[PDB]
Each structure stands twice: as structure tokens, then as C-alpha cells.
Amino acid sequence: RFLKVKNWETDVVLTDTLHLKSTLETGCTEHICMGSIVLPVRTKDQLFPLAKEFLDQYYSSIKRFGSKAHMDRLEEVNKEIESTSTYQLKDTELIYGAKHAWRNASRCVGRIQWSKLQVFDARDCTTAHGMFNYICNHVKYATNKGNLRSAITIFPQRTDGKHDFRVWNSQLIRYAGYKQPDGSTLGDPANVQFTEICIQQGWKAPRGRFDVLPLLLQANGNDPELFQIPPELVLEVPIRHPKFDWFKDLGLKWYGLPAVSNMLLEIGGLEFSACPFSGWYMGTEIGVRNYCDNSRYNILEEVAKKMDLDMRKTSSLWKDQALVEINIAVLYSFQSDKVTIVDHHSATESFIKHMENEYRCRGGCPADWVWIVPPMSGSITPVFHQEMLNYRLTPSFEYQPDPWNTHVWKG
Amino acid sequence: RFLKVKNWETDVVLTDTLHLKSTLETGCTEHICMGSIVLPTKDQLFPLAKEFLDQYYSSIKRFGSKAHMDRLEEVNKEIESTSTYQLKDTELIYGAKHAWRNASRCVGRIQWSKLQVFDARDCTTAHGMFNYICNHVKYATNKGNLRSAITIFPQRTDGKHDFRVWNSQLIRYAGYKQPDGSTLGDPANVQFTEICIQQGWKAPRGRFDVLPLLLQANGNDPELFQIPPELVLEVPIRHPKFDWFKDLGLKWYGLPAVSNMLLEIGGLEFSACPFSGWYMGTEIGVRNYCDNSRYNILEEVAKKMDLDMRKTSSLWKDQALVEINIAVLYSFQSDKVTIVDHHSATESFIKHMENEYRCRGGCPADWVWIVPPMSGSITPVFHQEMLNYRLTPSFEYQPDPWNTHVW
Ligand code: HEM
Ligand code: HEM
Ligand SMILES: C[C@H](O)[C@H](O)[C@H]1CNc2nc(N)[nH]c(=O)c2N1
Ligand SMILES: C[C@H](O)[C@H](O)[C@H]1CNc2nc(N)[nH]c(=O)c2N1
Ligand SMILES: NCCN[C@@H]1CNC[C@@H]1Cc1cccc(N)n1
Ligand SMILES: NCCN[C@@H]1CNC[C@@H]1Cc1cccc(N)n1
Ligand SMILES: [Zn+2]
Structure with missing residues (x-):
């Protein structure tokens, strides 16, 4: 056929x-x-x-x-x-x-x-410390001072299936999320549950807006253990806008290495x-999703106020206008700091x-x-207009249930 | 289950x-x-x-x-x-x-x-059809308060006595292929526009020529008719900041009326x-105006904004896109013709x-x-899982009549 x-x-x-x-x-x-x-277990x-x-x-x-x-x-x-x-x-x-x-x-x-x-x-890895060592070498090698590999x-x-090796973090590098008793959230809301787990495991959370999470590693089916990635290894980029000087004052930054670890x-x-x-980021993963999703950093309004857009009616497209600038800012910062990144048009x-x-x-x-198709400007990128067929071939990367929901603690 | x-x-x-x-x-x-x-x-x-x-x-x-x-x-x-x-x-x-x-x-x-x-x-002829469509266009346009x-x-x-409207929408603009190898008007209608001429239409060979209806009754041969100009409400596009915008000479009709289903x-x-019904902003601003194969006006709007189009990472295309869509929603509202923006929709x-x-x-x-063809993830539907399946009654696609008509 x-x-x-x-x-x-x-x-x-x-x-x-x-x-x-x-x-x-x-x-x-x-x-x-x-x-x-x-x-x-087959x-x-x-x-x-x-x-x-x-x-x-x-x-x-x-x-x-x-x-x-x-x-x-x-x-x-x-x-x-x-x-x-x-x-x-x-x-x-x-x-x-x-x-x-x-x-x-x-x-x-x-x-x-x-x-x-x-x-x-x-x-040949047998312990969590062993895992930590391996991961650091991966981060260091992959980061390559900004020219990512x-x-x-x-x-x-x-x-x-009782001796599984698991990296409890979803990505090797992610910012902590903290739930405040007033209901607001400090940091990345997507990581609140995992952050809680880390804290409960003994992590001393500095409780800021961009705290790099600790690695929680399980080796051979044993209880996970905490490790802090050497700071000097976590490459980060401060976010500023090429024409807007107030942008830098939003206090935004992002790590340079996207490393999925829960698959x-x-x-x-x-x-x-x-x-x-x-690999390396496509601009929109940070500028659209990470910053603008309502359930993530949600910076759309604050950026809109500063630009002074008409926010009385959505039909002004203030949300659309701010989104573009924010994404422009992410691409600009990365290129300026010589950290690999690609825009959604090129990609x-x-x-x-x-x-x-x-x-x-x-x-x-x-x-x-x-x-x-990217989460912004969908139809002005060629993929929108491309019909595709989705089917599964192996080898493959699959989703797997979060380890905290299945792990049998040993204490 | x-x-x-x-x-x-x-x-x-x-x-x-x-x-x-x-x-x-x-x-x-x-x-x-x-x-x-x-x-x-x-x-x-x-x-x-x-x-x-x-x-x-x-x-x-x-x-x-x-x-x-x-x-x-x-x-x-x-x-x-x-x-x-x-x-x-x-x-x-x-x-x-x-x-x-x-x-x-x-x-x-x-x-x-x-x-x-x-x-x-109770319709029996193409003329009757033309009469029905005009009454429909008028009732729905409703001086701008669309219904x-x-x-x-x-x-x-x-199947040998099928009634068909040859246009894809009651109201669309013609598309002519010039010697320049280029295309004048709406490239999506290039072919249909030809069939009109091949039938008699007097194309004014313009950029925004409201096409003639081509109606088919009881299986007979399609006939041409010109919707009364006073019935086709149009909106000239101006930006609420860029005065130069008006010079691109852009206009769009107010009535979205699918006729080929x-x-x-x-x-x-x-x-x-x-x-x-009535347009959602993005339909005109993003797809009609910017689709590379449509009026493809991004580059032009780009130049007028004086954006560095040297590299894709300046997101110039994206910036233009937003303005082109701010203008559409803007023009329509100003002329009081119903229109919804993609966030509201x-x-x-x-x-x-x-x-x-x-x-x-x-x-x-x-x-x-x-999901709208722009700003996808900032609209709520992007985050909404959906189940797609088919229920009747329904609207289905059907072969264009010219690729099936026994003259
Ligand atoms: C070289 C840089 C790369 C770029 C720019 C790229 C870009 C992307 C983007 C934009 C996504 C969707 C992001 C999201 O919404 O979560 C993605 C997903 C994915 N990528 Fe890549 N990628 C790259 C390298 C890799 C590598 C090295 C692998 C694996 C060896 C990989 C595996 C996948 C998989 C498995 C997904 C979907 C994950 C899921 O289902 O949640 N990517 N990639
Ligand atoms: C009143 C406001 C309405 C809005 C804002 C709306 C909006 C939309 C939009 C954005 C699309 C996609 C168009 C495209 O990309 O080609 C769509 C498709 C469609 N709409 Fe609606 N619509 C409205 C009224 C109607 C009415 C009155 C009907 C039918 C009685 C209808 C039937 C459909 C069908 C069948 C399609 C898909 C056509 C296709 O497969 O190409 N819509 N609508
Ligand atoms: C190939 C792909 O199916 C095609 O580009 C689709 C995508 N989404 C769309 N969505 C709407 N509303 N209208 C369209 O014409 C399309 N085109
Ligand atoms: C519900 C919906 O499928 C969900 O929002 C999907 C849509 N498309 C996406 N596309 C990318 N690249 N990444 C995502 O996380 C999603 N989320
Ligand atoms: N919902 C899945 C989470 N995926 C996160 C979203 N952004 C980085 C990572 C995807 C990914 C993997 C590899 C490379 C890349 N650019 N992006
Ligand atoms: N390509 C299929 C035809 N779709 C065209 C594209 N825009 C108008 C019409 C859809 C449509 C029907 C009803 C209302 C509306 N806003 N839009
Ligand atoms: Zn399917």
C-alpha cells in the first residue's frame, strides 16, 4: 500500500x-x-x-x-x-x-x-553517584561552552523491572517551582510537585525564581539520591531585548541545555x-511556552504593560504583540551570548x-x-501547509509513568 | 468506550x-x-x-x-x-x-x-437560484450586523439533475495569470476565474474583482450572474498607527459564505x-493575506515597516503578521462590520x-x-485535547463541478 x-x-x-x-x-x-x-518486563x-x-x-x-x-x-x-x-x-x-x-x-x-x-x-553504571558522574560529563560535553552538541x-x-535505573527529573536542568500559602507560585509552576519531592528528600531550596533543581537519581531500583549539578556547568543566558532596555529589568534568564530525562x-x-x-533549543520552546503559557511563567501581561499596549480589548492583539517581542528577546540574547539556538522559521x-x-x-x-507546528505564527512556517502521516517505528522514545507514582520505597 | x-x-x-x-x-x-x-x-x-x-x-x-x-x-x-x-x-x-x-x-x-x-x-432554474442567493447575501450582511x-x-x-454553485464562496476575488509569470489577484481562484471567461465573464482584470456567480440548476449547464454591487459589503484595510498602510490598496469582503459543500x-x-456566518480575524489577515500562495503580502508590509529582513531570527515576518492582523480587525470594527478575533473566538x-x-x-x-494559524499556544484551544469523529447530519466536501459536468 x-x-x-x-x-x-x-x-x-x-x-x-x-x-x-x-x-x-x-x-x-x-x-x-x-x-x-x-x-x-517482557x-x-x-x-x-x-x-x-x-x-x-x-x-x-x-x-x-x-x-x-x-x-x-x-x-x-x-x-x-x-x-x-x-x-x-x-x-x-x-x-x-x-x-x-x-x-x-x-x-x-x-x-x-x-x-x-x-x-x-x-x-556499566551501578550507583546513583555513578549516575551523577555520567550526567555531569554529559552536561559538560553537550554544553561545550555554548556551541551545543x-x-x-x-x-x-x-x-x-524491580531494578530500574531512573532519572526522577524530567529534564536534567529545570527551575524549581514553589507554591506559596497565598496560592501564588514562585518559580516555574510546572515543577512544584517534583520540587516538593526534592525538598522532602533533603534539598535546601534557596526559594528564588530561578533555582536550578538538584538531580534526583535512582540506580538499580534503589531509592533516589540528591546531587547538585556543579554550578559552573549550568550555562545560563540572561534575557534582554535588542531595542527595549527595560526588558533586562524583567529579571529573566534561561538555561541553555534542553535535556529530556524522563523518557x-x-x-x-x-x-x-x-x-x-x-540537543539545543528552538526559540519558541522558551519564549512562547516556558514564558507565556498561563500555567508557566505567564509574563505576557507584565511585558504588555511596559510596552504600553492597549490591553482593554483582546482585539488589539496586545497578547500577540508582546509574544513576538519576548521571542525576539530570547533569540537575541542567545545569539549575543553565542549559545546555540534556532528560530522556528529556520527549524x-x-x-x-x-x-x-x-x-x-x-x-x-x-x-x-x-x-x-510551532506554538506561534503557525501558518507562516512551511510545516503548517504540509500534510503528514503519524505512525510508530522502533527504536523509539516512549513516555513512562513518573517514578514517584510507582516506586516501591525501601527506606 | x-x-x-x-x-x-x-x-x-x-x-x-x-x-x-x-x-x-x-x-x-x-x-x-x-x-x-x-x-x-x-x-x-x-x-x-x-x-x-x-x-x-x-x-x-x-x-x-x-x-x-x-x-x-x-x-x-x-x-x-x-x-x-x-x-x-x-x-x-x-x-x-x-x-x-x-x-x-x-x-x-x-x-x-x-x-x-x-x-x-421550490427552486427550478439558475435565475431562481440567483434570486435566492441575493436575498441570502442581503439578509446575512444586514448592513454590517451579520447574521x-x-x-x-x-x-x-x-446525480443527473444536481443543483450546484460553482464558486467556493458566494463572494470571492478573481485570479489572473499574467505574462510576467506572476499572478494578479487571488491565485486560489485562477482556474475558476478562467472557467468564468470560458463562459463569458468580462474580467476587469483587477486585483480585487468580485467574481460572478456561476449557477447550475437541475443538472443543466452553469449560468453566470453578477451579484448586485450594492449587496457586496467590503472593508478597505487601514492600520490604526501606520497611515502608509492604506497604500497597499487592501480590501476584503465582509461575508464569508461557503458554497461548495x-x-x-x-x-x-x-x-x-x-x-x-462571519469572519474570525486570522482567516483574512493570516491565510488570505500572508499564505505564500495567496495574496502573499508579508515581504511588502515588511519593507514598509523597515524591518531587518536580512535574517529570519529578527522575527520580521512575525512582526509584520501581527500588524497585518491588527489592521484587519481594526478596519472591520471601524466600519461596524461584524468580526471576531481569534482570542475571543x-x-x-x-x-x-x-x-x-x-x-x-x-x-x-x-x-x-x-487552533488559529497564529499565536496558537496563547489561545486556550491549543491546550485542549479534542476527539475527532463524524456525525450526521453533516457538511461534506464534494468534487468541483467542472471536473464532473457532462455539458
Ligand atoms: C538538535 C536540537 C534539537 C531541536 C531544535 C529539537 C526540537 C524539538 C522540539 C521543538 C520539540 C518539541 C518540544 C516540546 O514541545 O516539548 C522536540 C521534541 C522531541 N525531540 Fe527534539 N530536537 C532536537 C534534538 C533532539 C534529540 C537529540 C532527541 C533525541 C535523541 C530529540 C527527541 C525528541 C523527542 C523524543 C521529542 C518529543 C518529546 C515528547 O514526546 O514530549 N530531540 N524536539
Ligand atoms: C458565525 C461565525 C462563525 C465563525 C467565527 C466560524 C469560523 C470558522 C473557521 C475559522 C473555520 C476554518 C475556515 C478555514 O480555515 O477554511 C470554519 C470552518 C467551517 N465552518 Fe464555521 N464559522 C462560523 C459560522 C459557520 C456557519 C454558519 C456554518 C455552517 C452553517 C459553519 C460551518 C463550517 C464548516 C463546515 C467549516 C469547515 C469547512 C471546511 O472543511 O473547509 N461555520 N468556521
Ligand atoms: C496540511 C494541513 O492539514 C493544512 O495546512 C491545514 C492545517 N490547519 C488548517 N486550519 C484551518 N482552520 N484551515 C485550513 O485551511 C487549515 N489547513
Ligand atoms: C492538548 C494538545 O495536544 C497539547 O497542548 C499539545 C499540542 N501541541 C504541542 N506541541 C509541542 N511542540 N509541544 C507540546 O507540549 C504540545 N502540546
Ligand atoms: N512536554 C515535553 C517536554 N519537552 C521539553 C520542552 N522544551 C525542551 C524539551 C523538548 C526538547 C528535547 C530536545 C531538544 C529540544 N530543543 N527540545
Ligand atoms: N478552504 C475551505 C473554505 N474555508 C473558507 C476560509 N474562510 C472562509 C471559509 C470558512 C468559513 C465559513 C464560515 C465562517 C467563517 N468565518 N469561515
Ligand atoms: Zn488520527
């Missing part, structure tokens, strides 16, 4: 054959689309086929499908599973696996960069519950090229329109 | 049960989502009719009554006998209002029940059912969704289309 996607701004049409290798479910039926819904039995599919892709990718090296590996993995109930990946496969999990991330607009990924093998650290895979990495059946990864255009390429050389590019 | 939708900005969760009555297909499978794709017999008819009437009677608290039963056999006999049937006025109105109610891609459905329905089923309406022409019989009620098909839709969940158990909604 062939599927066509059309771009209504250029009439360009594309054919997807890749979806034919899609095994996982989407959440949608013939009678219902769930395209806008955010969140919709047996020997299911494991080998999953291992086999993966290794087949792997060997085809290196042009050795059906080779003796290939057949031997299948046999090797086969035996190991029957003997130990699981199996270890060779460095080449882990690496090849992680890049493809990224390459298959249908909600990621930055995928043109998928083949350039530094993979750190942290499978994509990277991922992969800790030991799940075994019996699970699935490769050839194996589950890597702790696999932090980082979406690049993605469109990446996408087309993917159809030509791979027969498709799974993409989630709801997430690929 | 019972699905929940969460608003990630307010944490509110709603339970949708209405989707279980869904009947048509979505285009998706459990393997692939097609949510961003723009266009994904007597034995057949009675069940469709039955489904409709039951819901009609259910709505008027008389489900399973004699009237219900009676009507049910009357239509039943008529279908067998006449191989089709006619709807009672009451059913027509209810049908239309509900087709709008079920339009998962329309952000303005909170207004659904306030719909003026014009029964144009929603739909005029329903005769239903389909054997197909209205389906109780199995019956109304192939010519033009309908209208989406906010109304959230409340509507909530009323629909608690008073109907759901609200089909298409996120990709509901």
Missing part, C-alpha cells in the same frame, strides 16, 4: 511506504482520531522476534543482511535470551539504536540532526528507563527538507503535525 | 460518550493517524432516514411516540414507493442546524442554534447549500465544548483546524 501526502503551498506530493513497517498502535481507530491527545516469548526485527534492520543498514556475521548474531542473541532471558547489545547496535529512536521521533522537528548524536554508554547517556536496561528508550525489545538526551524549513529527503531515501518520515 | 479529554492548562477532564454514535469513517487506522490530511439504494436510504428521525424525535421529547412511529412509516412507504423522500420543514431546519453543530472543523459552533434557514427547495444563514436548494435525485440529512443529499469555543460535553456527552472537534 502507498499513501500520499500533499503540501498545499507547493502542490508537492509524497508517497509513504515506510508506514508498512509500522507495528505499534496509534490510539486512533477508523471511527476516531486521537491525534491531539498528549498521552494515548517474556522470552515476545523478546526474540523483537530482537530479530531490530537486528535485521541493523544488518540491512550496514549492508550485511543475510551475512554470516548477521546469522551468527541472531543465533548469539537467540541463545543468550533462552539462557539469561534477555540480551546485551554491542556498542554499534546501541549507537545505531539510539540514533534511530531519534530518527523515528515523530513529534521532533529537529530530526535533520539525527545522524549526529554523541552516544555515551553508561551501561547533541548527546545521550544510556544507563542499564530494565531486567525484572524510556526501546531498542530491539530492550527497555532503557534512564536515557537522558539533549521548520530545515525539517521540511529533512522530511522530503526521508521519503526519497527511506520511503517516509513519521511526523506528528500537532507537535511539529 | 468512554474517552476522556484533558485541558493541560486547567487540568479539567471531560468524558466523551457521543463518539459511540459516530457512524462515518475518519481516515485513520490503529497503525496510522491521518489527522493532518486535508481531504482524507432504497436499502441504504431507509436506515439513514430512520437514524435521523429517531434523533429528531428524541430531540423533541417524543421518541417512540405515535407521531414518531407514524412519520417513520410515512417516510418508509414513500422511500419504497418514490425511491426517496422529502423532509418536513421542521426536519430541514433541525437537520441544517445540526450539520453545523457537527462541523468538527468550525471554531464558531457555539452559535450553532442561531441559524436562519432558507428553504429554497448566520444557509439557503438549501433541491436535494439530489439521480454538500449537506447531508437523513440520507438525503443537498449539493447546493451555501451557508455563511477560541475562548467561546472552549465554553461551547464544555456545554456540549455536559449537555450532549461530547463535541467532535478537529484540533489541526480549530
Whole structure:
């Protein structure tokens, strides 16, 4: 079967054959689309086929499908599973696996960069302190003094699901959120619950507006432990506006390294519950969402007052006007401090090229329109006008329940 | 069986049960989502009719009554006998209002029940059609205080006597391809504009030439007609700060009136059912004005603002976008022609969704289309999970008539 996607701004049409290798479910039926819904220990039995599919892709990718090296590996993995109930990946496969999990991330607009990924093998890690060490090296390497580099650290895979390695933070770096008894919130509201957990665990919260949270790390299924990231390692950018001098007085700043740490990495059946990864920000993640979501820093009004926009009627589009300036400010600061960052125009255009390429050389590019289109100026970026097909391929990054909801404390 | 939708900005969760009555297909499978794709017999008819009437009677608290039963056999006999049937006025109105109610891609459905329905089923010719459309345009324009309406022409019989309005909207601007390789006017209508000429229209070859209606009756050949100029209310666009704005020479009509869709009620098909409401700002300012393939005026507005268009990171395109949309809302209000801004429009839709969940158990909604093409995440709907599915009565797309007309 062939599927066509059309771009209504250029009439360009594309054919997807890749979806034919899609095994996982989407959440949608013939009678219902769930395209806008955010969140919709294996047996020997299911494991080998999953291992086999993966290794087949792997060997085809290196042009050795059906080779003796290939057949031997299948046999090797086969035996190991029957003997130990699981199996270890060779460095080449882990690496090849992680890049493809990224390459298959249908909600990621930055995928043109998928083949350039530094993979750190942290499978020999056994303790939280061990984890902390690994993470610091990742932050330092990835930050690279502002000239950011994509990277991922992969800790030991799940075994019996009782010895999981988990990074309790959602991102390696995030500001604390504190709930005041008066109902207002200090810091980033999105992190209040986790901050509470950190405090309860012994963290001495400075209680400011931009407190870098401590790392809460679980190793081998044990209770998590706290670590403070060396300050000198946390690159941060003060936010100012190129024409507005009062902007700097808003006291805004942001860290430079976006590093998602709560996702699970699935490769050839194996589950890597702790696999932090980082790239570099697209302007809008900070300027639109982080600052302007009503449930985040909500700086839209304060910025509007200072600009003195007509805030009596929404039809003045004061909210729209302020949003643009704020985003202009984020891009400006980052470029000025020489910290890697990309604007949504550049990013979406690049993605469109990446996408087309993917159809030509791979027969498709799974993409989630709801997430690929930026949270501002949607239709003046090329992706808006691009039809897409969303389906799931492995390797892949999956959501996993927050560890505090499932962890069996040992005390 | 019972699905929940969460608003990630307010944490509110709603339970949708209405989707279980869904009947048509979505285009998706459990393997692939097609949510961003723009266009994904007597034995057949009675069940469709039955489904409709039951819901009609259910709505008027008389489900399973004699009237219900009676009507049910009357239509039943008529279908067998006449191989089709006619709807009672009451059913027509209810049908239309509900087709709008079920339009998962329309952000303005909170207004659904306030719909003026014009029964144009006694129509027999293109002239009659032209007469009906003019009355509709006039009644809905209402000197600027817009009122929603739909005029329903005769239903389909054997596909060989279909009534069709060839335009995509009652009111649109022409598009001509110049030697310059460039395009004059609205590129979206380039082709339709040609078909007009190929039929006689005297294109004034202007930038904003209100096109002529091209009407088709009882399967006959489409005929041309020029809506009375005094009936097409227009708004010249000026910015409330940039006096130079007026020099781009921009104007837009006040009446958004989709004419190419197909209205389906109780199995019956109304192939010519033009309908209208009023614009949400972004429709003109963002899509019509800035879409690269439309009037594509961003670069121009950019130059006038003297913005550094050297690099994309200056967000010049974004700054222009906002102004171009401030001007639209501005001009319309100034001339007192009804118009809603995307913040107000989406906010109304959230409340509507909530009323629909608690008073109907759901609200089909298409996120990709509901979220405005600008400032997406600052509008509430961006944070609103939606369930998309198809309910009848409904408005469906249909092949342009020229790619199907046996002259
Ligand atoms: C090189 C810089 C990169 C850029 C500019 C980029 C951009 C983005 C953006 C804008 C999002 C959506 C943000 C949000 O709303 O949460 C995103 C999501 C995502 N990206 Fe990337 N990305 C990059 C690198 C990476 C890397 C290195 C990986 C993995 C190896 C990755 C994996 C994903 C995944 C899994 C998601 C969706 C996460 C979710 O479902 O919540 N990205 N990316
Ligand atoms: C009264 C104010 C109304 C507002 C603000 C409103 C707004 C909108 C908007 C923004 C769209 C998307 C338009 C596009 O991007 O092409 C839409 C689509 C639509 N609306 Fe409404 N609408 C209104 C009235 C109506 C009426 C009176 C009907 C029907 C009786 C209706 C039926 C639909 C349908 C069927 C679509 C989708 C058409 C398609 O698939 O292209 N709307 N509406
Ligand atoms: C409910 C809705 O799906 C939700 O707001 C989605 C929409 N699109 C998004 N797109 C991106 N990139 N990131 C997000 O967090 C979201 N949130
Ligand atoms: C390809 C994609 O489906 C297309 O660009 C959609 C996106 N969302 C839209 N939303 C609205 N309201 N109107 C449109 O025409 C579109 N176009
Ligand atoms: N809701 C998921 C949270 N994702 C957060 C939102 N902003 C950074 C991170 C995504 C991400 C991952 C990798 C690179 C990047 N630019 N962005
Ligand atoms: N491309 C499908 C046709 N959509 C066109 C785009 N703008 C007017 C009309 C939608 C529409 C119908 C009713 C009211 C409204 N504001 N908008
Ligand atoms: Zn879907």
C-alpha cells in the first residue's frame, strides 16, 4: 500500500511506504482520531522476534543482511535470551539504536540532526553517584561552552523491572517551582510537585525564581539520591531585548541545555528507563511556552504593560504583540551570548527538507503535525501547509509513568 | 468506550460518550493517524432516514411516540414507493442546524442554534437560484450586523439533475495569470476565474474583482450572474498607527459564505447549500493575506515597516503578521462590520465544548483546524485535547463541478 501526502503551498506530493513497517498502535481507530491527545518486563516469548526485527534492520543498514556475521548474531542473541532471558547489545547496535529512536521521533522537528548524536554508554553504571558522574560529563560535553552538541547517556536496561535505573527529573536542568500559602507560585509552576519531592528528600531550596533543581537519581531500583549539578556547568543566558532596555529589568534568564530525562528508550525489545538526551533549543520552546503559557511563567501581561499596549480589548492583539517581542528577546540574547539556538522559521524549513529527503531515501518520515507546528505564527512556517502521516517505528522514545507514582520505597 | 479529554492548562477532564454514535469513517487506522490530511439504494436510504428521525424525535421529547412511529412509516412507504423522500420543514431546519453543530472543523459552533434557514427547495432554474442567493447575501450582511444563514436548494435525485454553485464562496476575488509569470489577484481562484471567461465573464482584470456567480440548476449547464454591487459589503484595510498602510490598496469582503459543500440529512443529499456566518480575524489577515500562495503580502508590509529582513531570527515576518492582523480587525470594527478575533473566538469555543460535553456527552472537534494559524499556544484551544469523529447530519466536501459536468 502507498499513501500520499500533499503540501498545499507547493502542490508537492509524497508517497509513504515506510508506514508498512509500522507495528505499534496509534490510539486512533477508523471511527476516531486521537491525534491531539498528549498521552494515548517482557517474556522470552515476545523478546526474540523483537530482537530479530531490530537486528535485521541493523544488518540491512550496514549492508550485511543475510551475512554470516548477521546469522551468527541472531543465533548469539537467540541463545543468550533462552539462557539469561534477555540480551546485551554491542556498542554499534546501541549507537545505531539510539540514533534511530531519534530518527523515528515523530513529534521532533529537529530530526535533520539525527545522524549526529554523541552516544555515551553508561551501561556499566551501578550507583546513583555513578549516575551523577555520567550526567555531569554529559552536561559538560553537550554544553561545550555554548556551541551545543547533541548527546545521550544510556544507563542499564530494565531486567525484572524491580531494578530500574531512573532519572526522577524530567529534564536534567529545570527551575524549581514553589507554591506559596497565598496560592501564588514562585518559580516555574510546572515543577512544584517534583520540587516538593526534592525538598522532602533533603534539598535546601534557596526559594528564588530561578533555582536550578538538584538531580534526583535512582540506580538499580534503589531509592533516589540528591546531587547538585556543579554550578559552573549550568550555562545560563540572561534575557534582554535588542531595542527595549527595560526588558533586562524583567529579571529573566534561561538555561541553555534542553535535556529530556524522563523518557524510556526501546531498542530491539530492550527497555532503557534512564536515557537522558539533549540537543539545543528552538526559540519558541522558551519564549512562547516556558514564558507565556498561563500555567508557566505567564509574563505576557507584565511585558504588555511596559510596552504600553492597549490591553482593554483582546482585539488589539496586545497578547500577540508582546509574544513576538519576548521571542525576539530570547533569540537575541542567545545569539549575543553565542549559545546555540534556532528560530522556528529556520527549524521548520530545515525539517521540511529533512522530511522530503526521508521519503526519497527511506520511503517516509513519521511526523506528528500537532507537535511539529510551532506554538506561534503557525501558518507562516512551511510545516503548517504540509500534510503528514503519524505512525510508530522502533527504536523509539516512549513516555513512562513518573517514578514517584510507582516506586516501591525501601527506606 | 468512554474517552476522556484533558485541558493541560486547567487540568479539567471531560468524558466523551457521543463518539459511540459516530457512524462515518475518519481516515485513520490503529497503525496510522491521518489527522493532518486535508481531504482524507432504497436499502441504504431507509436506515439513514430512520437514524435521523429517531434523533429528531428524541430531540423533541417524543421518541417512540405515535407521531414518531407514524412519520417513520410515512417516510418508509414513500422511500419504497418514490425511491426517496422529502423532509418536513421542521426536519430541514433541525437537520441544517445540526450539520453545523457537527462541523468538527468550525471554531464558531457555539452559535450553532442561531441559524436562519432558507428553504429554497421550490427552486427550478439558475435565475431562481440567483434570486435566492441575493436575498441570502442581503439578509446575512444586514448592513454590517451579520447574521448566520444557509439557503438549501433541491436535494439530489439521480446525480443527473444536481443543483450546484460553482464558486467556493458566494463572494470571492478573481485570479489572473499574467505574462510576467506572476499572478494578479487571488491565485486560489485562477482556474475558476478562467472557467468564468470560458463562459463569458468580462474580467476587469483587477486585483480585487468580485467574481460572478456561476449557477447550475437541475443538472443543466452553469449560468453566470453578477451579484448586485450594492449587496457586496467590503472593508478597505487601514492600520490604526501606520497611515502608509492604506497604500497597499487592501480590501476584503465582509461575508464569508461557503458554497461548495454538500449537506447531508437523513440520507438525503443537498449539493447546493451555501451557508455563511462571519469572519474570525486570522482567516483574512493570516491565510488570505500572508499564505505564500495567496495574496502573499508579508515581504511588502515588511519593507514598509523597515524591518531587518536580512535574517529570519529578527522575527520580521512575525512582526509584520501581527500588524497585518491588527489592521484587519481594526478596519472591520471601524466600519461596524461584524468580526471576531481569534482570542475571543477560541475562548467561546472552549465554553461551547464544555456545554456540549455536559449537555450532549461530547463535541467532535478537529484540533489541526480549530487552533488559529497564529499565536496558537496563547489561545486556550491549543491546550485542549479534542476527539475527532463524524456525525450526521453533516457538511461534506464534494468534487468541483467542472471536473464532473457532462455539458
Ligand atoms: C538538535 C536540537 C534539537 C531541536 C531544535 C529539537 C526540537 C524539538 C522540539 C521543538 C520539540 C518539541 C518540544 C516540546 O514541545 O516539548 C522536540 C521534541 C522531541 N525531540 Fe527534539 N530536537 C532536537 C534534538 C533532539 C534529540 C537529540 C532527541 C533525541 C535523541 C530529540 C527527541 C525528541 C523527542 C523524543 C521529542 C518529543 C518529546 C515528547 O514526546 O514530549 N530531540 N524536539
Ligand atoms: C458565525 C461565525 C462563525 C465563525 C467565527 C466560524 C469560523 C470558522 C473557521 C475559522 C473555520 C476554518 C475556515 C478555514 O480555515 O477554511 C470554519 C470552518 C467551517 N465552518 Fe464555521 N464559522 C462560523 C459560522 C459557520 C456557519 C454558519 C456554518 C455552517 C452553517 C459553519 C460551518 C463550517 C464548516 C463546515 C467549516 C469547515 C469547512 C471546511 O472543511 O473547509 N461555520 N468556521
Ligand atoms: C492538548 C494538545 O495536544 C497539547 O497542548 C499539545 C499540542 N501541541 C504541542 N506541541 C509541542 N511542540 N509541544 C507540546 O507540549 C504540545 N502540546
Ligand atoms: C496540511 C494541513 O492539514 C493544512 O495546512 C491545514 C492545517 N490547519 C488548517 N486550519 C484551518 N482552520 N484551515 C485550513 O485551511 C487549515 N489547513
Ligand atoms: N512536554 C515535553 C517536554 N519537552 C521539553 C520542552 N522544551 C525542551 C524539551 C523538548 C526538547 C528535547 C530536545 C531538544 C529540544 N530543543 N527540545
Ligand atoms: N478552504 C475551505 C473554505 N474555508 C473558507 C476560509 N474562510 C472562509 C471559509 C470558512 C468559513 C465559513 C464560515 C465562517 C467563517 N468565518 N469561515
Ligand atoms: Zn488520527
